Scaffold this active site. Structure first.
Site, PDB file in Angstrom:
ATOM      1  N   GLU B  49       0.871  -1.172   0.000  1.00 56.19           N
ATOM      2  CA  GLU B  49       0.000   0.000   0.000  1.00 56.19           C
ATOM      3  C   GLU B  49       0.909   1.224   0.000  1.00 56.19           C
ATOM      4  O   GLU B  49       1.807   1.336   0.837  1.00 56.19           O
ATOM      5  CB  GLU B  49      -0.918   0.007   1.235  1.00 56.19           C
ATOM      6  N   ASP B  60      -4.574  11.402   8.360  1.00 56.05           N
ATOM      7  CA  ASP B  60      -3.387  10.619   8.697  1.00 56.05           C
ATOM      8  C   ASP B  60      -2.876  10.976  10.099  1.00 56.05           C
ATOM      9  O   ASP B  60      -2.908  12.137  10.490  1.00 56.05           O
ATOM     10  CB  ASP B  60      -2.277  10.830   7.660  1.00 56.05           C
ATOM     11  N   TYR B 175     -10.720  -3.360   3.703  1.00 56.83           N
ATOM     12  CA  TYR B 175      -9.776  -2.866   4.697  1.00 56.83           C
ATOM     13  C   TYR B 175     -10.505  -2.806   6.043  1.00 56.83           C
ATOM     14  O   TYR B 175     -11.334  -1.930   6.281  1.00 56.83           O
ATOM     15  CB  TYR B 175      -9.262  -1.484   4.267  1.00 56.83           C
TER      16      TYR B 175
END
Ligand SMILES: *Cc1c(COP(=O)(O)O)cnc(C)c1O
Ligand SMILES: [Cl-]
Ligand SMILES: [Cl-]
Ligand SMILES: [Cl-]
Ligand SMILES: [Cl-]
Ligand SMILES: [Cl-]
Ligand SMILES: [Cl-]
Ligand SMILES: [Cl-]
Ligand SMILES: [Cs+]
Ligand SMILES: [Cs+]
EC number: 4.2.1.20
Lengths: 395, 256
Positions: B49, B60, B175
């Site tokens: 990834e 993030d 995911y």
């Protein structure tokens, strides 16, 4: 699904990580409920009146317009508790937090104006307020940091990334994503993901509602145009909303032109940016060719952002509202003009709105026109900025 | 997306889980990044990834924020990242390559054209961090037209409607950020979802083995690889050695 439309035409949406969607859905449901609840409305009305001081004055300014056919009123949001219109909507959002059973508020701040507004609403309503602030910003904003701390807020320096606003916003949203059961994220303008553009408009619409009633009382008609500065879009959408269906009334939003649009040093994405997706919304933004978000610039920190709320982009696209820009130099002249001729020290943000109204007058001085400027805040905060500029160029 | 199907079929034949590291492309510079990525694959990474540096990431954590900023210090652009991706694919024919993008970088020059460029350079999947399933339609559609798997996050806060949507819309892998963990995995299988990779804070061998026992198809290490890069900036040699050691250990844990 959602209960309300997240889009204004092609603009808006909910462009957040999946983990945040339940928080946005919860907030939308609580807002829809609140708007139907007379008790909520009465509590909000009580705070606006008895704590914030609404209704705000509508001042007719005679010296500035002498010898022209312009009649100019200023909607006095500068007189609201806190010194700007921001107070209106943070009080509403604090009441929404309480409605959802929350006792904690998260905000982020750069120059600190939204941080102070969030801290004051939280202090009044007994909410525990944490305000994320990039470490570089804390160092440069001692006065606002001190105001927030006096009001009992926890100001949390953020050192990761570039240690500025982006990094503080990230951390605030990271916090929220984990704590939304107990904490409400208090977004500071009419932008970001649905439902915030909608909530912020509805919790600012008393600006335009009062202006309409006051101008009907004083002049027996509607204004020819209402004029507001546009940072993220809250004071302008609050002034515009009650006039949108009054098709004869001009809606003029004024973006900061900074050093001049041609310099690229401005904060005027609605007319001089490009649609993008960022901060939870599809909206005009200032962008590099390869889709990085550009740095904006304005003499006025309150306007200095590279995007704008999606409802403004929509109102522009359909031609209902018109958007213009005003440079730093034009805003400074308006600031000096209001001080000298009306005894009102305006925020440099608000000075952009007044500068455009002054231009409408001076360009066509025999045109009959009834104008209202949203005077979004007072300019005590700006006297050092103004002094420093005037001294630098020798005047 | 076919590289994922082949990978999971082969892993299933070996009764093995997938181990998938995340790194930021161009961190701490282009040439070191290419060496890092080769090391990850050589050490046993089953897929990658890969992040493209973005000016204002709002999804993030600090470790990744810092990597993002380093890649800018090297002047890394999306164009340069796509140059790197074509190189990586040219060296590694079967390793699935997934991107972790912010929406604006996909939307910038047209969503379709973004996925066409992904297909040209041989990317297999794209996870767009700030596009929830509710807003995903144009992204999913462009991905599928260009043979790219659209990846979706299944959060811990996930309800049945969301499970059904992620199962329906995703390809390649689901995911999972982890209702009970083994229950989510069972429901995703009931709904014919793409095989699940667990991505919640995966930093040690025992979490990889735990993921496999829970019947996930493997595990993604969202930030542990990046931490190693950060710790070892002054010594590129030591950096590669520690990355090799870590990935070796994590892959060993998947062989269950
Ligand atoms: C914050 C602020 C603005 C700009 O914010 P909007 O959301 O665009 O209204 C304008 N004027 C003042 C005085 C402000 O404090
Ligand atoms: Cl709807
Ligand atoms: Cl009601
Ligand atoms: Cl009433
Ligand atoms: Cl408290
Ligand atoms: Cl009325
Ligand atoms: Cl599927
Ligand atoms: Cl991680
Ligand atoms: Cs006049
Ligand atoms: Cs702006």
């Amino acid at each position: 699904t959602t209960l309300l439309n997240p889009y204004f035409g092609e603009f808006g949406g909910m462009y957040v990580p999946q983990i945040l969607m339940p928080a946005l859905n919860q907030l939308e449901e609580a807002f829809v409920s609140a708007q139907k609840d007379p008790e909520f409305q009465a509590q909000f009305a009580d705070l606006l009146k008895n704590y914030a001081g609404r209704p705000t004055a509508l001042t007719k300014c005679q010296n500035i317009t002498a010898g022209t056919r312009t009649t100019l009123y200023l909607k006095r949001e500068d007189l609201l508790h806190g010194g700007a219109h921001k107070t209106n909507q943070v009080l509403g959002q604090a009441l929404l937090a309480k409605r959802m059973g929350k006792s904690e508020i998260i905000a982020e701040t750069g120059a600190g104006q939204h941080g102070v507004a969030s801290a004051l609403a939280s202090a009044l309503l007994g909410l525990k307020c944490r305000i994320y602030m990039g470490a570089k910003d804390v160092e440069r904003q001692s006065p606002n940091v001190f105001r927030m701390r006096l009001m009992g807020a926890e100001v949390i320096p953020v050192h990761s990334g570039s240690a500025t606003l982006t990094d503080a916003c990230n951390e605030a949203l990271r916090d929220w994503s984990g704590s939304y059961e107990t904490a409400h994220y208090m977004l500071g303008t009419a932008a970001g993901p649905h439902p915030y553009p909608t909530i912020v408009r509805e919790f600012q619409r008393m600006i335009g509602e009062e202006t309409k009633a006051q101008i009907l009382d004083k002049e027996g008609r509607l204004p020819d145009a209402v004029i507001a500065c546009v940072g993220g879009g809250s004071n302008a959408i609050g002034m515009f909303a009650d006039f949108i269906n009054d098709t004869s009334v001009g809606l003029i939003g004024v973006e900061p032109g900074g050093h001049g649009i041609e310099t690229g040093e401005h904060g005027a994405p609605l007319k001089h940016g490009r649609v993008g997706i960022y901060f939870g919304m599809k909206a005009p933004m200032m962008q590099t060719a390869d889709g990085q978000i550009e740095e904006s610039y304005s003499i006025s920190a309150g306007l200095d952002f590279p995007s704008v709320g999606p409802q403004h982009a929509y109102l522009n696209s359909i031609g209902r509202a018109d958007y213009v820009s005003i440079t730093d130099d034009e805003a400074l002249e308006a600031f000096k003009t209001l001080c000298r001729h009306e005894g009102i020290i305006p925020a440099l943000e608000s000075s952009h709105a007044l500068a455009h109204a002054l231009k409408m007058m001076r360009e066509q001085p025999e045109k009959e026109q009834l104008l209202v400027v949203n005077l979004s805040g007072r300019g005590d905060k700006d006297i050092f900025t103004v002094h420093d500029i005037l001294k630098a160029r020798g005047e | 997306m076919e590289r994922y199907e082949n990978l999971f079929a082969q892993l299933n034949d070996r009764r093995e889980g997938a181990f998938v590291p995340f790194v930021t492309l161009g961190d701490p510079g282009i040439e070191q990044s290419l060496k890092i990525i080769d090391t990850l694959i050589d050490a046993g990474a089953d897929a990658l990834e890969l992040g493209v540096p973005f000016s204002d990431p709002l999804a993030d954590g600090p470790t990744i924020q810092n990597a993002n900023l380093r890649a800018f210090a090297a002047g890394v652009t999306p164009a340069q990242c796509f140059e790197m991706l074509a190189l990586i694919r040219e060296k590694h024919p079967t390793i699935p390559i997934g991107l972790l993008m912010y929406a604006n970088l996909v939307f910038n020059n047209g969503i379709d054209a973004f996925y066409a460029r992904c297909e040209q350079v041989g990317v297999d999947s794209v996870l767009v961090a700030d596009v929830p399933v509710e807003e995903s339609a144009p992204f999913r559609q462009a991905a599928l037209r260009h043979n790219i798997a659209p990846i979706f996050i299944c959060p811990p806060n996930a309800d049945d409607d969301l499970l059904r949507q992620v199962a329906s819309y995703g390809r390649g892998y689901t995911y999972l950020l982890s209702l009970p963990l083994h229950h989510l995995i069972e429901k995703l299988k009931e709904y014919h979802a793409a095989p699940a990779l667990q991505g919640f804070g995966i930093s040690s061998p025992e979490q990889v083995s735990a993921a496999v026992r829970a019947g996930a198809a493997g595990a993604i290490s969202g930030s542990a690889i990046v931490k190693i890069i950060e710790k070892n900036l002054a010594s590129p040699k030591q950096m590669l050695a520690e990355l090799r050691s870590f990935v070796s250990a994590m892959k060993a844990a998947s062989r269950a």
